[PDB]
Write an enzyme that holds these catalytic residues in place. Structure first.
Site, PDB file in Angstrom:
ATOM      1  N   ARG A  75      18.894  93.407 -44.324  1.00  0.00           N
ATOM      2  CA  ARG A  75      19.522  94.728 -44.223  1.00  0.00           C
ATOM      3  C   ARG A  75      18.517  95.833 -44.444  1.00  0.00           C
ATOM      4  NH1 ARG A  75      25.557  94.430 -45.612  1.00  0.00           N
ATOM      5  NH2 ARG A  75      25.315  96.619 -46.249  1.00  0.00           N
ATOM      6  N   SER A 144      14.657  87.426 -51.190  1.00  0.00           N
ATOM      7  CA  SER A 144      15.552  86.359 -51.667  1.00  0.00           C
ATOM      8  C   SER A 144      14.882  84.973 -51.791  1.00  0.00           C
ATOM      9  CB  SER A 144      16.753  86.259 -50.726  1.00  0.00           C
ATOM     10  OG  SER A 144      17.362  87.530 -50.583  1.00  0.00           O
ATOM     11  N   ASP A 197      16.910  88.791 -54.994  1.00  0.00           N
ATOM     12  CA  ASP A 197      18.262  89.249 -54.705  1.00  0.00           C
ATOM     13  C   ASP A 197      19.154  89.199 -55.948  1.00  0.00           C
ATOM     14  OD1 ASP A 197      17.904  86.486 -54.383  1.00  0.00           O
ATOM     15  OD2 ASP A 197      19.531  86.284 -52.949  1.00  0.00           O
TER      16      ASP A 197
END
Ligand SMILES: Nc1ncnc2c1ncn2[C@@H]1O[C@H](COP(=O)(O)OP(=O)(O)NP(=O)(O)O)[C@@H](O)[C@H]1O
Ligand SMILES: OC[C@H]1O[C@@H](O)[C@H](O)[C@@H](O)[C@@H]1O
Ligand SMILES: [Mg+2]
Length: 456
Positions: A75, A144, A197
């Site tokens: 994102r 992540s 994350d």
């Protein structure tokens, strides 16, 4: 019936998680939490120092960008922040699905694809976002995967997880990798923070609720972060921080322990995985793996008990053909003839028609698999609560969650909550709160890029 039942009996045996065991497991998680914190070589829980000594206040303000890279998509994000009253005045975002190839090609191809979105996303910058002239856009990077941090804004990749396997980049510094790629796009931007994350999601949560002590992810992968006392970290070397506080990334995906109730199916999944031997706990619970375990159990049934006809369907022999969103489709069917389940089987097994007893056995298999994952993940959260000494009463403790598995798989969600509460006991459970902090890693990183601006 009877050939089918032998193997289901064996699954039920192997996957069993009686609460007593769950507490056993919770305990083990704490021991491993401690070993990881002692720099104990080859601790399975790394317990990585984030360099995050201050979680967000509320009082942050400015323009900040975030880039959140995940297992299956990334994102790009901006927020305009207006201090303690106004807060989060404006926010936009684009989510793109990561192309399979970029999971397994080159570092360059990856960060180029990422950067190119970022760059084209910045152009479209409206005017309800603004930053003093002269000035450089700053950027929080949610990554992540397990990084070895070297500063707030720097760190080297330890190992890829969950479907990534890109050769160049282990041991390299990921922020420099992003930076090169951004600038190859003619894109003036600075990375002021680098976070996992789980850390991002802990920062996002804490920004709306001050009793957030921890954050778990349950998505493509699974992992958890919590706020640790800095004086409870033997492997700390340096000056303690003002706050007394350091956020840890547990990387509990990599928990293993004889106590984990595992099967041939889990063994075989691992054997044929991208990362054999690694992330053994994760592979029992997170979303990249649940559908595949279901598939393998169904494949035994179709073979040893003709469950789906006298020949096993070709499609059922394809690895990864049964994904976890398909699995929760089947699982949540409440029709009397299991219509919807059957429609999914038709589609995925490429079969024409299905026994109704076959449909009830599929639903049962889904049930056992999701149930184990959820009960095991609850043990982990209980482990954390133990570490924080919030497993007992004498206190409001919030645990932020993120990940599509958790957000969308309703029965997985409620099995995890029922079990957490079971483990905590009544009194203690009234103290704790599990709250959705969806897509929270993204914003959490912008907020932390704020605290670390090159400006005021
Ligand atoms: N309806 C669903 N039912 C069950 N699982 C789902 C559903 N939708 C999504 N998921 C799982 O959750 C993931 C969706 O994306 P998300 O939770 O944002 O993870 P990600 O950022 O791609 N990777 P990670 O950062 O490790 O969670 C998929 O990989 C699925 O396995
Ligand atoms: O996305 C959830 C988690 O997936 C795990 O498999 C990764 O190794 C972690 O870095 C991440 O926090
Ligand atoms: Mg994410």
């Amino acid at each position: 019936i009877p050939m089918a039942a032998a193997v289901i009996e064996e699954v039920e045996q192997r996957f069993s998680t009686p609460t007593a065991l769950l507490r056993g497991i919770a305990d083990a998680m704490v021991e491993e939490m401690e070993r990881g914190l002692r720099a104990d070589p080859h601790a399975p829980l790394k317990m990585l120092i984030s360099y995050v000594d201050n979680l967000p206040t509320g009082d942050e303000h400015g323009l900040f960008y975030a880039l959140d890279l995940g297992g299956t998509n990334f994102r790009v994000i901006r927020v305009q922040l207006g201090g303690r009253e106004k807060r989060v005045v404006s926010q936009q975002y684009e989510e793109v699905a990561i192309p399979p190839h970029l999971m397994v090609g080159t570092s360059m191809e990856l960060f180029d694809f990422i950067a190119a979105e970022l760059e084209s996303f910045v152009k479209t910058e409206g005017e309800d976002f603004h930053l003093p002239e002269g000035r450089q856009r700053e950027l929080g990077f949610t990554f992540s995967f397990p990084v070895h941090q070297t500063s707030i804004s720097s760190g080297t990749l330890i190992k890829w997880t969950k479907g990534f396997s890109i050769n160049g980049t282990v041991g390299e510094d990921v922020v420099a990798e992003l930076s090169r790629a951004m600038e190859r796009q003619g894109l003036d931007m600075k990375v002021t923070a680098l976070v996992n994350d789980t850390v991002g999601t802990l920062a996002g949560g804490r920004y709306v609720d001050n009793d957030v002590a921890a954050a778990v992810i349950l998505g493509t992968g699974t992992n958890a972060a919590y706020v640790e006392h800095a004086n409870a970290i033997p492997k700390w070397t340096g000056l303690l921080p003002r706050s007394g506080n350091m956020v840890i990334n547990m990387e509990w995906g990599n928990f293993k322990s004889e106590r984990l109730p595992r099967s041939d199916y889990d063994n075989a999944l691992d054997f044929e995985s991208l990362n054999p031997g690694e992330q053994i706990y994760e592979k029992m619970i997170s979303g990249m793996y649940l559908g595949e375990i279901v598939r393998r159990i169904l494949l035994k049934l179709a073979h040893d008990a003709s469950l789906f006809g006298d020949v096993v369907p070709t499609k059922l022999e394809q690895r990864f053909i049964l994904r976890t969103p398909d699995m929760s489709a089947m699982h949540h069917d409440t029709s009397h003839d299991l219509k919807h389940l059957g429609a999914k089987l038709k589609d995925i097994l490429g079969v024409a028609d299905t026994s109704l007893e076959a449909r009830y056995i599929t639903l049962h298999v889904c049930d056992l698999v999701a149930e184990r994952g959820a009960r095991l993940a609850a043990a982990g959260i209980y482990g954390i609560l133990k570490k924080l000494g919030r497993d007992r009463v004498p206190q409001r403790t919030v645990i932020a969650l993120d990940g599509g598995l958790y957000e969308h798989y309703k029965k997985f969600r409620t099995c995890l909550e029922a079990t957490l509460a079971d483990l905590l006991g009544e009194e203690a459970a009234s103290s704790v709160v599990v709250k959705l902090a969806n897509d929270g890693s993204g914003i959490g990183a912008a907020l932390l890029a704020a605290s670390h601006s090159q400006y005021a």
